[PDB]
Amino acid sequence: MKRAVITGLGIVSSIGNNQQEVLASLREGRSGITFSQELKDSGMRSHVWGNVKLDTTGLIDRKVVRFMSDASIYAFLSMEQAIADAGLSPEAYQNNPRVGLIAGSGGGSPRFQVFGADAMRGPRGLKAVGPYVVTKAMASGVSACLATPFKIHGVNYSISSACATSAHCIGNAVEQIQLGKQDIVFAGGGEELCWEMACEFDAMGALSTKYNDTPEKASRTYDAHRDGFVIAGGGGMVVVEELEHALARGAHIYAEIVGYGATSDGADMVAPSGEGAVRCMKMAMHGVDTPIDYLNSHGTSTPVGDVKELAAIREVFGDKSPAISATKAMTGHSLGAAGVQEAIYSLLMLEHGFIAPSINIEELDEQAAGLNIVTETTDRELTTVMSNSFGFGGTNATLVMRKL
Amino acid sequence: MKRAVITGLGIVSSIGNNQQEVLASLREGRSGITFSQELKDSGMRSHVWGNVKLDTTGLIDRKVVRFMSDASIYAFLSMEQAIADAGLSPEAYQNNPRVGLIAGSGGGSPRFQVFGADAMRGPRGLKAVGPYVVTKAMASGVSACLATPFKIHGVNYSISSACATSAHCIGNAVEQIQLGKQDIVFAGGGEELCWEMACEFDAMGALSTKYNDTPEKASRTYDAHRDGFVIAGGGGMVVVEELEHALARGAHIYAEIVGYGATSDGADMVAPSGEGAVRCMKMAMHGVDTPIDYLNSHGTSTPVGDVKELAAIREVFGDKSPAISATKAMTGHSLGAAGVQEAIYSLLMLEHGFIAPSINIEELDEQAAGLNIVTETTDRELTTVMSNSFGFGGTNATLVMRKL
Numbered sequence: 001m002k003r004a005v006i007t008g009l010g011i012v013s014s015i016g017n018n019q020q021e022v023l024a025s026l027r028e029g030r031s032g033i034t035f036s037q038e039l040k041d042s043g044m045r046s047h048v049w050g051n052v053k054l055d056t057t058g059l060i061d062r063k064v065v066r067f068m069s070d071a072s073i074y075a076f077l078s079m080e081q082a083i084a085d086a087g088l089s090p091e092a093y094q095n096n097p098r099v100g101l102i103a104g105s106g107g108g109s110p111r112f113q114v115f116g117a118d119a120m121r122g123p124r125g126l127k128a129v130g131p132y133v134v135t136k137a138m139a140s141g142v143s144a145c146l147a148t149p150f151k152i153h154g155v156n157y158s159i160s161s162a163c164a165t166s167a168h169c170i171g172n173a174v175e176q177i178q179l180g181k182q183d184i185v186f187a188g189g190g191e192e193l194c195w196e197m198a199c200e201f202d203a204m205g206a207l208s209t210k211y212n213d214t215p216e217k218a219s220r221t222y223d224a225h226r227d228g229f230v231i232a233g234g235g236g237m238v239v240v241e242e243l244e245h246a247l248a249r250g251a252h253i254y255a256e257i258v259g260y261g262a263t264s265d266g267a268d269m270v271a272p273s274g275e276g277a278v279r280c281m282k283m284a285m286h287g288v289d290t291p292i293d294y295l296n297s298h299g300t301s302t303p304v305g306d307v308k309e310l311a312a313i314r315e316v317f318g319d320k321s322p323a324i325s326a327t328k329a330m331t332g333h334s335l336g337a338a339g340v341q342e343a344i345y346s347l348l349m350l351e352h353g354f355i356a357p358s359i360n361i362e363e364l365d366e367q368a369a370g371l372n373i374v375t376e377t378t379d380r381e382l383t384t385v386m387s388n389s390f391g392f393g394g395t396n397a398t399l400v401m402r403k404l
Numbered sequence: 405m406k407r408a409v410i411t412g413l414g415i416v417s418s419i420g421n422n423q424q425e426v427l428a429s430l431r432e433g434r435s436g437i438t439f440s441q442e443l444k445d446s447g448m449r450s451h452v453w454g455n456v457k458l459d460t461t462g463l464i465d466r467k468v469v470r471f472m473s474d475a476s477i478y479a480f481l482s483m484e485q486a487i488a489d490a491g492l493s494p495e496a497y498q499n500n501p502r503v504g505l506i507a508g509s510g511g512g513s514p515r516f517q518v519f520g521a522d523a524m525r526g527p528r529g530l531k532a533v534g535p536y537v538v539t540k541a542m543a544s545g546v547s548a549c550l551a552t553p554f555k556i557h558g559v560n561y562s563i564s565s566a567c568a569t570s571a572h573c574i575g576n577a578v579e580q581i582q583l584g585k586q587d588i589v590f591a592g593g594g595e596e597l598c599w600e601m602a603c604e605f606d607a608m609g610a611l612s613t614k615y616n617d618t619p620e621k622a623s624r625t626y627d628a629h630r631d632g633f634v635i636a637g638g639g640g641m642v643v644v645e646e647l648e649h650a651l652a653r654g655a656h657i658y659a660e661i662v663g664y665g666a667t668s669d670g671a672d673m674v675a676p677s678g679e680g681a682v683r684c685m686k687m688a689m690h691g692v693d694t695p696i697d698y699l700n701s702h703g704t705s706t707p708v709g710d711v712k713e714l715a716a717i718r719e720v721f722g723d724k725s726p727a728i729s730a731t732k733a734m735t736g737h738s739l740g741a742a743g744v745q746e747a748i749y750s751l752l753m754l755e756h757g758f759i760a761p762s763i764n765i766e767e768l769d770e771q772a773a774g775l776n777i778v779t780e781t782t783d784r785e786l787t788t789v790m791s792n793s794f795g796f797g798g799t800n801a802t803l804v805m806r807k808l
């Protein structure tokens with residue numbers, strides 16, 4: 001069947017506003033986490049976040065940006081980067097029924113939803129709301145706001161699956177190539193960063209609260225004293241392309257997507273089962289005839305979640321587990337953007353031949369013993385990498401990417 | 405290639421709480437639209453809606469429903485109906501890696517996004533927010549809140565695409581069957597009905613405002629004096645199943661999904677382009693060796709949209725129009741739920757041999773000549789039916805369903 005490769009990438013993240021900045025942060029083990037006065041002022045217990053450090057004012061034409069929330073702004077800038085990186089001209093990708101876009105967010109825009117309700121409840125009613133809230137607040141905002149300006153004619157929709165959102169977007173893009181329906185699908189996602197959404201996670205006890213005075217130490221996957229994830233925002237986009245089409249245009253190919261797992265736990269709303277993760281990893285590895293050299297774990301810095309995933313990894317890999325690191329210890333958890341951003345970090349590791357460190361492990365959890373959790377940047381010629389995304393609601397995605 | 409059939413359906417709609425009530429409404433041309441004191445009290449200009457007329461108290465177990473917003477409640481009730489209609493025991497669909505769920509909403513839960521923000525700003529802060537808002541508010545709430553209690557082990561995610569949401573969910577379910585990855589996928593969606601979301605549509609001028617004193621006449625697709633859509637809520641679910649699997653278990657089969665189009669306009673953000681719809685319909689018709697007997701139009705009762713779709717229909721079919729009716733004149737526009745609900749109305753027409761009327765056309769639009777818009781219930785043996793969903797943001801889905 002038809003093979004899918006990644007031929008371009010773009011990213012706006014807590015650890016860099018393009019792939020050059022991201023690569024430098026990954027190699028340096030640099031945290032993207034900062035103290036947030038906004039989260040503190042809202043009354044939250046978690047006062048830290050992985051913010052995008054970019055003035056986005058003016059970067060997008062007004063006729064386009066007027067429809068957008070921050071998730072769409074970050075995804076749009078990532079898409080522009082990905083198109084440039086792929087070397088795609090408008091003649092090639094615009095008004096082309098074989099070019100699609102599958103990109104989502106986990107939350108839509110709580111900020112604009114709340115803005116609309118607050119405005120409506122004041123004396124000016126509909127006049128205060130204005131005419132742009134639907135495209136900002138709707139769950140499909142990220143795909144809708146990008147498909148128009150980029151003149152996409154093929155598929156156009158958003159997948160959402162909480163932390164797995166943009167990993168399922170990439171896997172669905174692979175499926176469109178496999179079905180022969182598309183030659184290129186831009187795949188990815190975006191997530192805004194705001195107290196309106198963050199407080200929902202803090203209310204469920206999911207966020208880190210004990211390290212507000214030392215923000216760079218709060219996200220600490222696998223450390224014995226981890227206490228929840230650090231919320232983040234941003235976007236990412238990859239160009240998923242059919243192999244013969246890529247070769248025919250002289251594309252730069254980062255990797256082939258040689259496996260895509262998607263499963264469901266059917267168990268707990270907010271905690272992973274393990275069993276679903278084992279099936280998801282095995283599905284992504286089926287038929288893949290090379291070992292996993294590096295695994296970018298879901299690893300959010302939660303007491304239960306981090307070790308549930310490690311137990312699943314031990315079950316999948318038996319006595320030959322891969323090198324592992326949790327890049328969320330540097331970046332935080334960007335929710336709908338995490339799958340694509342972590343696919344990109346993994347592709348940069350593959351392209352540049354290094355493993356990024358799993359930072360802030362002052363005392364390794366007892367349940368991580370015996371695994372090669374890499375804690376210092378390591379040069380290594382990688383061939384095959386895996387990235388896990390295990391979302392709330394028991395939804396799992398795994399991607400396996402390999403050099404061609 | 406593996407073939408996909410529909411073996412069960414379930415629905416909670418403005419025109420009925422199960423398929424018996426929906427069938428009777430469709431045959432009678434009975435409006436589901438009522439006056440809404442909630443919309444009026446909120447300051448809106450549109451005071452009409454297609455509400456679900458059902459007391460849902462106690463229909464879902466407390467430990468299940470505590471995670472859910474109304475979109476999930478309606479989708480869950482629809483799924484229970486679909487499972488019973490498909491004759492699936494718990495042992496047949498639970499804990500089964502070959503059984504999946506793809507179901508979404510257009511808006512998630514504006515009500516619970518606003519609830520979380522309002523609670524956080526009050527005297528109890530995080531304690532008033534409570535631990536259930538993420539599962540209510542997140543874009544994937546509908547899939548997350550159903551996949552756990554129904555013990556789904558296969559695919560699990562949401563697609564969102566505004567009006568096309570649950571039609572793309574059904575098409576993607578068909579793709580899982582075609583790829584050989586699933587034997588059954590429950591596909592559908594839900595949408596809450598609330599001023600928090602409705603006011604955003606009224607603020608952009610999208611909703612009907614001139615007919616509040618006569619709610620049943622507000623939604624009037626193709627009428628010269630239409631003035632916007634009437635917002636609605638509800639849910640729907642279909643059981644998409646691989647053909648040989650269905651036959652081997654003695655399933656009742658409504659129809660095969662013989663075509664699925666998904667395209668993008670890539671054009672004016674706020675209006676349908678017409679051309680994307682043409683491409684979508686032709687994609688869904690490709691290889692289908694029988695004529696389209698009946699078309700359930702997207703037709704939302706908007707000035708621009710209704711006649712753009714008619715022009716696309718003329719381009720596709722020339723002088724050989726199928727019979728057409730816009731069931732939204734009865735039901736209103738249930739946004740994320742519209743694709744699956746309209747697929748279900750189309751399946752009921754196919755199963756029971758009639759065309760539902762396009763109601764409230766007192767003066768046919770000057771631009772609607774030369775087609776077969778059916779305005780009176782008409783008994784007729786149908787074989788192949790089409791349903792269009794042309795979503796805000798230029799995202800299109802079309803489904804073609806045919807008797808076996």
Ligand SMILES: CC(=O)c1sc(Nc2ccccc2)nc1C
Nearest residue numbers: 138510566567610706739740796
């Ligand atoms: C003017 C129109 O016809 C429409 S249809 C529509 N649909 C949805 C559905 C679900 C989420 C967002 C938008 N929005 C508008 C403004």
